[PDB]
């Protein structure tokens, strides 16, 4: 058989699935937001304006895999380290409003589901669609072999 | 029978004393209706203490560390409760906490 989300590079795929939520106009930003700090760790923040999709892509990436991943988990996958100043070189802070948005939105997108009203785990449909997407992107590469085999 | 998963959990200030405990009770309890699936032992917990020694004022401000590892042994039995209680008539020493629990 084939290549699902378990088998596929988001480097092409999230970059496309981001677009699945974009291109289609399914969910986008919430009313409360659209500015976006990196999270409490940084000003410079999303050069990619698509961060929330990307986020959604990634919360979704989480949710099929770690079925039942709560709010607090999303804070952690968020990661980073901080050079504070003439001070320690120590790990960073995840902004929860938006985390919580992402959670609200992918479930509204019906790709996420609040498993046991909590930690999210995927919609069936999500992952078939993901695998579908995976194949479409996969084949036509700007690398080496096989659009001509 | 209507077994009881008995968990007799034995945590001890050394591994030493408790194994002695563990074994003998089980031997005693067993013989015969006490039926046990072999003893599993949960992580030895360790207590660390480093101290600033010396009241060097002057001389080396060097520091020394004592430790107490605490050893956990568990055996589970699918056994009779009254029999358990019949064998449970051991006054047992210290340094060996032994807990007995009846879940399933």
């Amino acid at each position: 058989k084939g290549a699902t989300l378990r088998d596929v590079h988001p480097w092409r795929w999230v970059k496309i699935c981001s677009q699945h939520f974009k291109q289609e106009g399914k969910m986008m930003v919430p009313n409360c937001a659209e500015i976006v700090k990196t999270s409490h760790g940084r000003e410079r923040a999303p050069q990619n304006p698509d961060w929330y999709y990307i986020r959604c892509a990634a919360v979704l990436r989480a949710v099929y895999l770690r079925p039942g991943v709560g709010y607090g988990g999303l804070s952690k996958r968020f990661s980073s380290k901080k050079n504070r100043g003439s001070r320690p070189e120590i790990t960073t802070r995840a902004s929860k409003g938006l985390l919580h948005w992402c959670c609200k939105s992918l479930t509204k997108l019906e790709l996420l589901e609040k498993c046991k009203g909590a930690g999210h785990r995927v919609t069936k449909l999500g992952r078939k669609v993901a695998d579908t997407i995976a194949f479409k992107i996969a084949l036509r590469k700007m690398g080496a072999e096989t659009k001509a085999k | 029978q209507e077994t009881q998963r008995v968990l007799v959990k034995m945590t001890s200030r050394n591994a030493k004393a408790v194994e002695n405990v563990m074994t003998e009770l089980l031997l005693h309890a067993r013989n015969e209706k006490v039926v046990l699936r072999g003893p599993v032992r949960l992580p030895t917990r360790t207590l660390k203490v480093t101290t600033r020694k010396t009241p060097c004022g002057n001389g080396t401000n060097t520091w020394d560390t004592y430790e107490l590892k605490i050893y956990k042994r568990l055996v589970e039995l699918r056994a009779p409760t009254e029999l358990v209680k019949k064998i449970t008539s051991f006054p047992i020493d210290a340094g060996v906490d032994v807990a007995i629990t009846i879940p399933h």
Binding site: - | R13, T46, V49, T51, K53, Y66, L68
Partner: protein, 42 residues
């Protein structure tokens, strides 16, 4: 912060090792490791 410990061996804020509900002076701790069971690790 240094005024609420009052070492239960010694009433002391200073000299007392602050560790795991204990309140003994550093010396007192050095004296006690055996009955308690702490043996050198390093």
């Amino acid at each position: 912060g240094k005024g609420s410990r009052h070492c239960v061996i010694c009433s002391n804020q200073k000299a007392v090792i602050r560790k795991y509900e204990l309140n003994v002076c550093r010396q007192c701790f050095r004296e006690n490791a055996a009955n308690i069971g702490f043996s050198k690790l390093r």
